[PDB]
Enzyme design. Structure first.
Site, PDB file in Angstrom:
ATOM      1  CE  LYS B   8      -2.690   3.138   2.221  1.00 20.62           C
ATOM      2  NZ  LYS B   8      -1.904   4.279   3.012  1.00 20.62           N
ATOM      3  N   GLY B  11       0.584   8.847   1.051  1.00 26.42           N
ATOM      4  CA  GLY B  11       1.738   9.748   1.784  1.00 26.42           C
ATOM      5  C   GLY B  11       1.673  10.936   0.532  1.00 26.42           C
ATOM      6  N   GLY B  45      -3.340  10.699  -0.802  1.00 24.41           N
ATOM      7  CA  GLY B  45      -1.655  11.231  -0.305  1.00 24.41           C
ATOM      8  C   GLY B  45      -1.615  13.335  -0.559  1.00 24.41           C
ATOM      9  CG  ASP B 162      -3.307   3.346   6.006  1.00 22.16           C
ATOM     10  OD1 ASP B 162      -2.763   2.305   5.331  1.00 22.16           O
ATOM     11  OD2 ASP B 162      -3.136   4.375   6.506  1.00 22.16           O
ATOM     12  CE  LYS B 217      -0.629   4.741   8.718  1.00 25.99           C
ATOM     13  NZ  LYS B 217      -0.959   4.569   7.443  1.00 25.99           N
TER      14      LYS B 217
HETATM   15  N1  ADP Z   1       2.079   7.252  17.003  1.00 25.74           N
HETATM   16  C1  ADP Z   1       2.226   7.919  15.833  1.00 25.74           C
HETATM   17  N2  ADP Z   1       2.987   7.010  15.586  1.00 25.74           N
HETATM   18  C2  ADP Z   1       3.574   7.193  13.666  1.00 25.74           C
HETATM   19  N3  ADP Z   1       2.335   8.582  13.183  1.00 25.74           N
HETATM   20  C3  ADP Z   1       1.304   8.942  13.747  1.00 25.74           C
HETATM   21  C4  ADP Z   1       1.368   8.802  15.460  1.00 25.74           C
HETATM   22  N4  ADP Z   1       0.205   9.641  15.427  1.00 25.74           N
HETATM   23  C5  ADP Z   1      -0.145  10.233  14.958  1.00 25.74           C
HETATM   24  N5  ADP Z   1       0.825  10.118  13.597  1.00 25.74           N
HETATM   25  C6  ADP Z   1       0.263  10.877  12.543  1.00 25.74           C
HETATM   26  O1  ADP Z   1       0.143   9.846  11.720  1.00 25.74           O
HETATM   27  C7  ADP Z   1       1.149   9.815  10.274  1.00 25.74           C
HETATM   28  C8  ADP Z   1       0.994   9.394   8.738  1.00 25.74           C
HETATM   29  O2  ADP Z   1      -0.373   8.736   8.627  1.00 25.74           O
HETATM   30  P1  ADP Z   1      -1.446   9.411   7.149  1.00 25.74           P
HETATM   31  O3  ADP Z   1      -1.151  11.027   7.384  1.00 25.74           O
HETATM   32  O4  ADP Z   1      -1.993   8.491   7.047  1.00 25.74           O
HETATM   33  O5  ADP Z   1      -0.230   9.304   5.472  1.00 25.74           O
HETATM   34  P2  ADP Z   1       0.653   8.003   5.566  1.00 25.74           P
HETATM   35  O6  ADP Z   1       0.024   7.183   5.885  1.00 25.74           O
HETATM   36  O7  ADP Z   1       0.929   8.083   4.161  1.00 25.74           O
HETATM   37  O8  ADP Z   1       2.060   8.283   6.286  1.00 25.74           O
HETATM   38  C9  ADP Z   1       2.547  10.373  10.330  1.00 25.74           C
HETATM   39  O9  ADP Z   1       2.596  11.669   9.179  1.00 25.74           O
HETATM   40  C10 ADP Z   1       1.983  11.790  12.008  1.00 25.74           C
HETATM   41  O10 ADP Z   1       1.749  13.241  12.136  1.00 25.74           O
END
Ligand code: ADP
Ligand code: ADP
Lengths: 258, 258
Positions: B8, B11, B45, B162, B217
């Protein structure tokens, strides 16, 4: 399996829920009364036009084809291969039709190359491989193909939907019906021209009767007609009562003679 | 045929031509050294985010999921199912990969229904039919699936990528790797968490460590892990040198335990 029938959609059809409903009603009726498998090819029509108009982006043409700058291919691909394609898939689902959305590059169905550097990301469509689509048809799916393509180098290309339809018709050895806002090709008085030959098309173009994309549309239809060895129809999607007979063969617009 | 592997993507990956090249290099290498067939699932993304930002459209979330008003589903579908999907197909073509673009409704691969009226056109994804995709995999194609879906009533739905990936994994009985901007799930100090269980996830959420879509996620990954009966990985797409080993099994991010 029989030679499929390609019905090409475009224009302002997507701006009318009523027209879409009446069209899909006719599509379902056709499917449930025929053995010839259907394939839909579509352009961007009003979906792209309204978006561009809304983004204050100009729409310039050069010989019937609209210039597609590199900084606009992504948004046009979005409106055409995304919004238009999926809207049609949604209508199919709503009518219990098992459809599969595709663009010209899927299974290399239609080969596309850059047509002219002056046009930007505008593709030239030529016959590709019928394997993928033939397999989908065999399995009972209704392929719904957008007019966006891609070059072997990975560059997205915007292809005139009529030319895309003709290229796919050649690829599949399919019958072809091009649906437009108007009832076929119109003469100087704006009246429907029943039949069209290459000789007559040349004259009408010379007289300034056939212009813009209509030159592209007629030349494309004539190309399909000679390649397939049989007539191609250009008709309207506006009048619901006319669709059933048209899909079955009744001449409702302009019949392009091979 | 073996259980496929779903990778998958999402971003800001699509904002980097370099990252896309290194990723596809790793994809080609994986394909040419493995018998397990690949399937790609992707979200919108940066493609959607930048468009919305450009159209001056707000992006509001409610429990990790972004509200998708009816007047925006068309433009988002365009950016996600159109631009993002076709950009990935273009990269595949550029690398001589025979890919086929699909959205969740094609072949009813993933069943989608409206999740909550407060979210608008946001879909809830659940397992669908694996027939279409299984047939494509058997025929040698690389399915590239967008996270847009459609209800049986014909309404387009924006699905969290996701959750869409997890639903497809269940549908296909496929292994799953979720690639993100960061190296898995981060703790309070912003450090990578090597392993994750439902118990630990509950604690981290309670402590406010895991928030927003990360809650969606992780819950999705945990759901896939328990359903499949095996671990699911959440890792980064940023470091090229890490991709080959990751795709082959080396733990580079957060391993979600079943
Ligand atoms: N505990 C956490 N660990 C990691 N990322 C987190 C956490 N809590 C929140 N996030 C947010 O999740 C984001 C990633 O998810 P998402 O924005 O959906 O994008 P992607 O899955 O493409 O990286 C990170 O950029 C962060 O801002
Ligand atoms: N001789 C002609 N006969 C019919 N339409 C013509 C002719 N010359 C130009 N046109 C233009 O072609 C248009 C239709 O082509 P097009 O804009 O590509 O949309 P569509 O094929 O969806 O109807 C008509 O709306 C008209 O403005």
């Amino acid at each position: 399996m029989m030679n499929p029938l390609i019905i090409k959609l475009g224009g302002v059809l997507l701006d009318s829920e009523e027209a879409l409903e009446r069209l899909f009603s006719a599509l379902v009726n056709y499917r449930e009364s025929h053995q010839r498998p259907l394939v839909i090819v579509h352009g961007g029509g009003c979906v792209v036009d309204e978006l561009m108009k809304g983004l204050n982006l100009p729409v310039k043409k050069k010989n019937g084809l609209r210039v597609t700058p590199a900084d606009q291919i992504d948004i046009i691909t979005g409106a055409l291969a995304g919004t238009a394609n999926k809207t049609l898939l949604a209508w199919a689902k709503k009518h219990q039709i098992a459809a599969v959305g595709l663009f010209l590059g899927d299974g290399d169905s239609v080969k596309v190359t850059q047509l002219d550097e002056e046009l930007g990301h505008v593709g030239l469509a030529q016959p590709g491989s019928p394997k993928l689509i033939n397999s989908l048809l065999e399995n009972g799916y209704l392929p719904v193909v957008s007019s966006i393509g891609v070059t072997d180098e990975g560059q997205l290309m915007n292809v005139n939907a009529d030319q895309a339809a003709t290229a796919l018709a050649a690829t599949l050895g399919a019958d072809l019906i091009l649906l437009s806002d108007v009832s076929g090709i119109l003469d100087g008085k704006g009246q429907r021209i029943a039949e069209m030959t290459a000789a007559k098309a040349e004259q009408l173009i010379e007289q300034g009767i056939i212009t813009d994309g209509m030159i592209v549309k007629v030349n494309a239809a004539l190309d399909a007609a000679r390649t397939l060895g049989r007539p191609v129809d250009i008709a309207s999607w506006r009048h619901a009562e006319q669709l059933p007979a048209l899909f079955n063969g009744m001449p409702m617009g302009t019949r392009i003679l091979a």
